[PDB]
Structure formats: C-alpha cells, structure tokens
Design an enzyme around this catalytic site. Structure first.
Site, short mmCIF file in Angstrom:
data_model
loop_
_atom_site.label_atom_id
_atom_site.label_comp_id
_atom_site.label_asym_id
_atom_site.label_seq_id
_atom_site.Cartn_x
_atom_site.Cartn_y
_atom_site.Cartn_z
N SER A 109 0.80 -1.22 0.00
CA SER A 109 0.00 0.00 0.00
C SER A 109 0.86 1.30 0.00
CB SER A 109 -0.96 0.02 1.18
OG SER A 109 -1.94 -1.00 1.02
N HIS A 113 -2.20 -3.86 -6.36
CA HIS A 113 -2.72 -3.48 -5.03
C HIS A 113 -4.18 -3.86 -5.04
CE1 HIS A 113 -3.87 -0.21 -1.93
NE2 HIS A 113 -3.06 -1.02 -1.27
N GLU A 167 -5.56 -1.85 -8.24
CA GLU A 167 -4.78 -0.74 -8.75
C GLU A 167 -3.50 -1.37 -9.29
OE1 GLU A 167 -4.72 1.55 -4.86
OE2 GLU A 167 -5.58 3.16 -6.28
N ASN A 185 -6.23 5.17 -1.73
CA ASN A 185 -5.92 5.55 -0.33
C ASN A 185 -5.68 7.04 -0.20
OD1 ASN A 185 -6.19 3.13 1.09
ND2 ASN A 185 -4.14 2.44 0.46
N1 LIG Z 1 -5.90 -4.68 4.34
C1 LIG Z 1 -4.60 -4.93 4.21
O1 LIG Z 1 -3.92 -5.56 5.02
C2 LIG Z 1 -3.90 -4.51 2.99
C3 LIG Z 1 -4.58 -4.02 1.87
C4 LIG Z 1 -3.81 -3.72 0.77
C5 LIG Z 1 -2.43 -3.97 0.80
N2 LIG Z 1 -1.80 -4.42 1.92
C6 LIG Z 1 -0.37 -4.74 1.92
O2 LIG Z 1 -0.24 -6.20 1.80
C7 LIG Z 1 0.96 -6.69 2.42
C8 LIG Z 1 0.68 -7.83 3.42
O3 LIG Z 1 -0.24 -7.38 4.39
P1 LIG Z 1 -1.10 -8.41 5.28
O4 LIG Z 1 -2.24 -7.60 5.84
O5 LIG Z 1 -1.30 -9.80 4.62
O6 LIG Z 1 -0.07 -8.57 6.49
P2 LIG Z 1 -0.15 -9.75 7.59
O7 LIG Z 1 0.84 -9.28 8.63
O8 LIG Z 1 -1.55 -10.22 7.92
O9 LIG Z 1 0.49 -10.93 6.71
C9 LIG Z 1 1.87 -10.80 6.34
C10 LIG Z 1 2.35 -12.21 6.05
O10 LIG Z 1 3.58 -12.16 5.32
C11 LIG Z 1 4.46 -13.14 5.87
N3 LIG Z 1 5.90 -12.87 5.67
C12 LIG Z 1 6.77 -12.07 6.35
N4 LIG Z 1 8.01 -12.17 5.81
C13 LIG Z 1 7.91 -13.02 4.76
C14 LIG Z 1 8.81 -13.57 3.74
N5 LIG Z 1 10.12 -13.21 3.74
N6 LIG Z 1 8.27 -14.45 2.84
C15 LIG Z 1 6.99 -14.85 2.83
N7 LIG Z 1 6.13 -14.39 3.72
C16 LIG Z 1 6.53 -13.49 4.67
C17 LIG Z 1 4.13 -13.18 7.32
O11 LIG Z 1 4.53 -14.42 7.79
C18 LIG Z 1 2.64 -12.96 7.35
O12 LIG Z 1 1.93 -14.20 7.44
C19 LIG Z 1 1.58 -5.41 2.95
O13 LIG Z 1 2.44 -5.05 1.88
C20 LIG Z 1 0.47 -4.37 3.13
O14 LIG Z 1 0.86 -2.99 3.00
C21 LIG Z 1 -2.53 -4.72 2.99
#
Ligand SMILES: NC(=O)c1ccc[n+]([C@@H]2O[C@H](COP(=O)([O-])OP(=O)(O)OC[C@H]3O[C@@H](n4cnc5c(N)ncnc54)[C@H](O)[C@@H]3O)[C@@H](O)[C@H]2O)c1
Ligand SMILES: NC(=O)c1ccc[n+]([C@@H]2O[C@H](COP(=O)([O-])OP(=O)(O)OC[C@H]3O[C@@H](n4cnc5c(N)ncnc54)[C@H](O)[C@@H]3O)[C@@H](O)[C@H]2O)c1
Lengths: 282, 282
Positions: free
Chosen positions: A117, A138, A150, A188
C-alpha cells in the site's frame, strides 16, 4: 499466466490466493513457518464455507478452489510460475530481499508484483535486474470480493508487463486500473485523508462521532461513515498512511490530526482491539 | 410548525417546498419574479406526478399537496409563518438584507433558517435582532428524497431554536445532525476536498478520469466516482466551496487545483452545461 506464486499468507495473501484460485488458477502460497501456511489455508477454507452457507457457491466449488491451492516454505517453487504476487510485510529492506531472491530464482518471463500500500515499486524493482517486469498489484480487503486492483507502474515497468497484468486481472474477474506510481495511488490518497478530515471535525468540536458518520451516510450515500471506516481499516493504518503521504510530498495538506495520533498511542486501533472511534464488544 | 415560508423557487427551494408540503405543512414559496415561482410550482408538480406513477401516492394526495402550496413574490407574506427556510442565491449581502427584512415582517416566534452551504449562519444572524432564532437548515439535493439535514448552530442560536428545528426535521421524516458552525459543516468539508484530490490525481498524471472513478466505486464502494460526482454537483460549486474553505481557514490543505479553476473558466461546469470532466448528451 495461470500459475501464480503468492508470498505471505496473512489477511491479504490468503484473500489474494483465494481470488486467483476461485477463477481457476493454479496457486502456490509461501510463508515463513509451516503453521503460517496452514492458518492461511484454514482462513481461506473458513471464507469459502461462508460462501457456501450464503449459497453463493456449492460445497463442490469450494473443494475445487481448495484443490487448486498448495502450501510450501520453499521459495524455489516460484521458479516456474507466471506471476508472483508478493503480499508479505510492509518493510522495504525485506521486500528488496524477497524481490532479489525472486529475481535469481524465477524464469526470466515471470512478472513480479507487490501488493504494498505504501512503499515504492520503483525502489523495490531497483533491487532486481528485471525492473521492466516489477509492478504493483494493489488489492483491496477482502480481496476475493472487492473488484478493484490498482495496477501500479513503477518508473521502469514496461508496457508489455502492464498489459499482461491487466489481462491477468480481467481474467480473474477484477477491474484493473492503471496508476503511474505516486503516494497513496488513487484510492488511499482520496479515502484516508477523508477519514483524517473526520478526525479534524471531531477534534475541533464541530460535531460528534455518530453525527459525523450519519451525515456521511445519509448526506453522501456512503455505505459506512468515515470514523467507523477508520475503526474498520485500523487507526494505526490510517495514521501510517497520512504520515507516508506527508513524508513523501512535504505537503502540509496530509498532516494527521493530533487526535488520531493519540488514539493510536492509547492502542485504540479500532475493531481489532475492540476500541477505536467506537467502543466495541464481542 | 403549521406554516413555512421558503425563499427561492429554484432547484432546492422547490425541493424543500415539496419536502415540507408533502408531510402536511402549509408552504408559501417566494421568488423575485412570477415566471420563477411558476417554474417552481411546475417542478414540484411534475415531481409529484412521478411519485404518482409508481404508486408512491395517488392523485388526491398530489393535489392535497399542491393545495398546501401558494406562490408569491411579496416577502410580506411571511408574516404568519412559523419557520422560514431561505434558499436564495449564495451571496452574503443579499442574505443579510433578506434576513433583516424577515426580522421586521415575521412574528417574534418565527425561526429564521438558511439552507446556505458556504456562508456563515452567524454573520447572517447579526443582520437581525433575533440571532437566537437564526440557524442553518442544510438539505441535500433532491430535498424530497435525501434524509439528512445538517442543522447548523450559529454562535447565538439558542438551545430551544435548535430543539425546535430538530423536532421539525424529524416531524418531516428527516434525520437532523447537530453542527456547531464551521466552514463546510460536515458533509461538504469531507466530500468536496475528496473531489478536489481526484482533480489533483488527474492533473499530476497519476491516472485517467474513468480509472479514478472506477477506483473509488470498486475500491471503496462509493455509489459514484468523484469526478462524475463533481460534474453532478457542478464544478463551479466544487470550486466555490474549496475557495470558501481555503479563505475561511487560511489553510493550504483546501487549495483547489489549477485544473479545477481551468475547467470552471471554460464553462465546463458539469452536467448542467453538458460538459465537465465528461462530455454529456440530451
Ligand atoms: N488490508 C490490508 O492488510 C492490505 C490491503 C492492501 C495492501 N496491503 C499490503 O499487503 C501486504 C501484506 O499485508 P497483510 O495484511 O497480509 O499482512 P499480515 O501481517 O496479515 O500478513 C503478512 C504475512 O507475510 C508473511 N511474511 C513475512 N516475511 C515473509 C517472507 N520473507 N516471505 C513470505 N512471507 C513473509 C508473514 O509471515 C505474514 O503471514 C503489505 O504489503 C500491506 O501494505 C494490505
Ligand atoms: N444543490 C444545490 O443546489 C444546493 C444544495 C445545498 C444548498 N444549497 C444552497 O441553497 C441556496 C440556493 O441554491 P439553488 O441551488 O436552489 O439555486 P437556484 O439558482 O436553483 O435557485 C436560487 C433561487 O433563488 C432566487 N432568488 C434570488 N434572490 C432571491 C430573493 N431575494 N428572494 C427569493 N428568491 C431569490 C432565484 O430567483 C432562484 O430561483 C444557496 O444558498 C446554496 O448554497 C444549494
């Protein structure tokens, strides 16, 4: 591109995996420990059951989506996939390591995409020798339902890579939109300061919580008011995004309200702590 | 409140006439020429037919409504009204004079309210000697259908005038929200800058019109995208509000984009001119 590697298996990874699998892609999902992958899978499985109870899909569709998804901790399994979607933690150092390693591993054809994001795709792609195939994809929570992606073009993202990610998105029934990379992209960048604006209103005593929200819902036909929506996205997330827009632009326009910073420092993060703008109960 | 005087037979004042009358208030609508009054009464009349067509009401209802509404161009006809709702043009010097006039004509108990989006209830109130009975009553187009009314307390608006306008809003089946006067109230203070941000996204090459609007619709579940919505509100209106917010606060956060001023200067005001962000037809 039908074979899809997804890194990370929390909220968005699980949702993204499901999104791809539900329209017939073969999907491998990779996390760090083995109980993370399992959780990711049980998450998806719970979500599909919710779709079956809704009678939105059959129990058989569910088993079939599941049949298309495999777990692993081995990054090497990426090597023969058409698309990687990285949805791991929002940290630049790490995303740069992931993308480097992925650059080493994957065939030269593979397109590599982040679901970040708030981090720069251009900066991520610079850690690779494949800048022309790094791109942002995204998604929006919950990724299986929300139809938007996006599609974020980094400075060096090729036309060819954009066109491919665009078709890939349509192929899974999503509406892609092209974005030349800038902070907050489109959604956003509009949505969050709208929430921050509702914090200012509140802080300046213009109106109270329930009223601010009723006003947005009845006055503007928004399905939820801004403060509730903050509580739902997470107030830490809201605060972090206003800080990114502000640090990236230098533009005082994106300054967060003091009240928002105070709520985050109280741990009043929203639903997920049972308290943000509203007090919640289970 | 048995009886309502409304200034303005335009879009809103016609709509507000309808909103009151259709719930059984008597209403006197006053404009500065007969043609205008006539125009107005025709509009309520065709809107009431439309309801009739879908069996929202029958003819007897319609004409029962029409019988509660009389037209005029003489201000002196507000002498017995319980509430005035001023929906005349957005101009301070004029509102002050209307309200000075109304203060002279109306019985001491009548409440004087304005439907202004962008002028200070408090400055208007000071042109009268009944500031405790002056208030904003800010409706949303179309006023028959939209439920919200922002009820805008000037600095001297009494608790009892507030309580009275609240009950009256409810008695015509609207949801009032209390607002302590500040620029943009609640709705427009959030909503208009959102449209201005979309104009900034466009001006800075981040993404194209249709994509910006699909983004907000499909990414945030907003019933319309902000560029289309701007074309619907009128870009002249978007610009004026960003300019009030900016001149009132001195805060650069509310600075309109150059693209917005430019479109307004070209006459590309929206649907009403057949061209804003999009080209329109018939
Ligand atoms: N609603 C949202 O959460 C949302 C919406 C749009 C974008 N994003 C983006 O998505 C991404 C992930 O967010 P999320 O909410 O799933 O976070 P989360 O913390 O729920 O999940 C992150 C996952 O990634 C894993 N991880 C960490 N290091 C790793 C690696 N080296 N290899 C593989 N896996 C690894 C973790 O183990 C974890 O299970 C971020 O970039 C965030 O900015 C989030
Ligand atoms: N969407 C909207 O149009 C909208 C929504 C909310 C609030 N408002 C506010 O309500 C007010 C009216 O806007 P509108 O959109 O109906 O404009 P409009 O141009 O549709 O109608 C305004 C009417 O006021 C009349 N008028 C001018 N001077 C007058 C006077 N001295 N006495 C009686 N009538 C007079 C004009 O003849 C005209 O018919 C403004 O203050 C505006 O900011 C408008």
């Amino acid at each position: 591109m039908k074979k899809v590697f997804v890194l990370g298996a929390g909220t968005m990874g699980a949702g993204i995996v499901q999104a791809f699998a539900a329209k017939g892609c073969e999907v491998i999902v990779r996390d760090i420990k083995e109980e993370f992958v399992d959780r990711g899978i049980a998450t998806i499985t719970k979500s599909l059951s919710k779709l079956v109870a809704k009678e939105k899909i059959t129990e058989a569709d569910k088993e079939e989506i599941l049949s298309r998804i495999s777990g692993t901790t081995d990054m090497k399994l990426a090597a023969d996939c058409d698309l990687v979607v990285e949805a791991a933690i929002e940290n630049m150092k790490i995303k740069k390591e992931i993308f480097a390693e992925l650059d080493g591993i994957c065939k030269p054809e593979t397109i590599l995409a982040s679901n970040t994001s708030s981090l720069s795709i251009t900066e991520v792609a610079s850690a690779t020798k494949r800048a022309d195939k790094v791109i942002g994809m995204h998604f929006f929570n919950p990724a299986p339902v929300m139809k938007l992606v996006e599609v974020i073009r980094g400075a060096a993202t090729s036309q060819e890579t954009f066109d491919a990610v665009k078709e890939m998105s349509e192929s899974i029934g999503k509406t892609p939109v092209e974005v030349a990379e800038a902070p907050g992209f489109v959604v956003n960048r509009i949505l969050i300061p709208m929430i921050n604006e509702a914090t200012f209103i509140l802080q300046e005593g213009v109106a109270k919580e329930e009223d601010i929200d009723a006003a947005m819902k009845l006055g503007a036909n928004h399905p939820m008011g801004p403060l509730a929506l903050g509580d739902l996205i997470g107030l830490d997330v809201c605060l972090a995004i206003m800080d990114v827009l502000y640090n990236e632009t230098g533009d005082t326009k994106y300054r967060a309200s003091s009240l928002l910073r105070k709520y985050v420092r109280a741990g009043w993060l929203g639903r997920k702590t049972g308290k943000g703008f509203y007090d919640y109960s289970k």
